[PDB]
Amino acid sequence: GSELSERIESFVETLKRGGGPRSSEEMARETLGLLRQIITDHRWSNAGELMELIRREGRRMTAAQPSETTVGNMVRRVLKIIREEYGRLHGHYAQLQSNIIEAINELLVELEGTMENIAAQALEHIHSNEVIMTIGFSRTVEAFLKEAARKRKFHVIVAECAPFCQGHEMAVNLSKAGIETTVMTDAAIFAVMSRVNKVIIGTKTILANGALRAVTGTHTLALAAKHHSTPLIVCAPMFKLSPQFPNEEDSFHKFVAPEEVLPFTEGDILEKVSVHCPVFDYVPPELITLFISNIGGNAPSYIYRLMSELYHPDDHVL
């Protein structure tokens, strides 16, 4: 009712203004909790009416932050849950609602153990005295490496991101586990790529090509790893998989204020200059070797299948 409305707009203004909550799995949990609160606090007789309700609120929720696609594809998976259960109950008022709620709770209990399942398969991709390269900061790759470091000894070249150096966080989080990590700038990637054995990165959104948007500077990292033919590991969960094609819509990169690149104390050259700060970058699927998700390892020639196993083609435009 009114509480639900104020919860929806507090979430939508939180995504419009800044990063709330901090990491992406928390936001997926908030989106699933908000959607279960939506389907428990409304009235419907047909499933398509609830479909259009979820579509009408999710359109505003994706219009808040179009770079944050976790809310959008999480809403889209809830829509596919609605469509699957309506199809399995059509071939239906309270049993259908409680089945949707328990399937969403199933989705939460599979979604909560995502990083630990990715960490459990980390040991089959890391051998001892190996040089790993990481861009940015990500909790998935951090759990991956600090799980593989319980039995292996290797090296990690974590590279900072030039707009705001978030990978320094990962360095001080890795050196607490004893990884022998190495911090450098992203101007040295191709300078060091001749000795990096494997590149293990995270991402922000997996697209339907197998392509991915990620923190800026990772398309350069993918090009340098394609030049040196080193494999790429994308430690990504299965809620960063979105059906949005790369060149379809605009607003792909998230541009932020140019303060982080060029400060305001520069002078009157700010009025005659064009400063851009794209915090995201697009990596085509041909520069990617392997995806590591909670269900295992997959090729970039397989993501479309995960799309058809997780989304419906009528909900792509949402």
């Binding site: 900072e160 991101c161 030039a162 707009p163 705001f164 150096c165 320094h168 966080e169 360095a171 001080v172 050196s175 607490k176 004893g178 990884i179 022998e180 990590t181 190495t182 911090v183 450098m184 700038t185 992203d186 101007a187 040295a188 990637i189 191709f190 300078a191 060091v192 001749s194 000795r195 800026t216 500077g217 990772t218 398309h219 350069t220 090009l223 340098a224 030049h227 990169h253 690149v261 060029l262 520069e266 002078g267 050259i269 005659k272 200059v273 064009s274 400063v275 851009h276 700060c277 794209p278 970058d281």
Partner: protein
Amino acid sequence: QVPTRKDYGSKVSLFSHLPQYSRQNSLTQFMSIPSSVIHPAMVRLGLQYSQGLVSGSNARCIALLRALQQVIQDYTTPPNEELSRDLVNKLKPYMSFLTQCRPLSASMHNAIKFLNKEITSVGSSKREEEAKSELRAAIDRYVQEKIVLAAQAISRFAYQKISNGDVILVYGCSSLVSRILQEAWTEGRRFRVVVVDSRPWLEGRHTLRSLVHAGVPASYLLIPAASYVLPEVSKVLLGAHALLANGSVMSRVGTAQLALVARAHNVPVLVCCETYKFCERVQTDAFVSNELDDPDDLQCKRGEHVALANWQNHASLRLLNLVYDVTPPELVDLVITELGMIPCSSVPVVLRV
């Protein structure tokens, strides 16, 4: 005599042969205030090298040659001894001190080679002040012809390359590319320049001012954003610090990165290097010969937390900020020298003879 500068931090296991110093401490803390072993111009130059006040490769070579002029003007001849051996033997510890302050760019090595060859070719029948003036004139001719006149020649050879309406990408700060762009804007070409900069030097801001004060439309961004702008770039100009024997291009660390991303976008690369920066040294990767700057320079203040403030307390943490890297010559299309526009793979053939 002259001690060794102390190694700072935990060195990289791959870079164990290369020295890694710090800008916090100086070598001149334990040296005499009246400069007696090293000439005072040499200790002034080494201090302003170690602190980073002169960072350009041509500015470092110029300050080296000017300090050598101050040494040669303030030189005296010992009894029954020749200039052509003692002056070399006195300038060699000077270059050792300059190496211990900061490793020399290949411009400085070739300048030392030219000065050593010139001071060997001083006649024995010539007097003191006549040979001193001859050496001063030779050093003056060297700087004038090698950099100033080669720069004008490179500017003329690059003006017939820059067209109207195109976009040009530059990286870092180098007086040669900035002079090329300025004299192309003044001579009539109307273009816009993007500028890629990188941490922690952020020296591209310098060339940004140089293009805004010259009236050039400019765009400023960092290295990771280069993949975003190379779709707009039609030409990438680069400033080389050394050209190697195999045709590789030694420059700042983002040079090879930018060349790879530019080739991925089908963007022709153009290096501009003067022929005195030609090295007989040859290398195939960015690992066997490079300079390591301060690892405590990589830290920055993003809010109220500096992640790398106490980075030395973490024993398993290593910090490295390379200054130079090399590009393979199959990434570079032009090499614009004062001898002309040559390809990259033909550079040691024409440079040698």
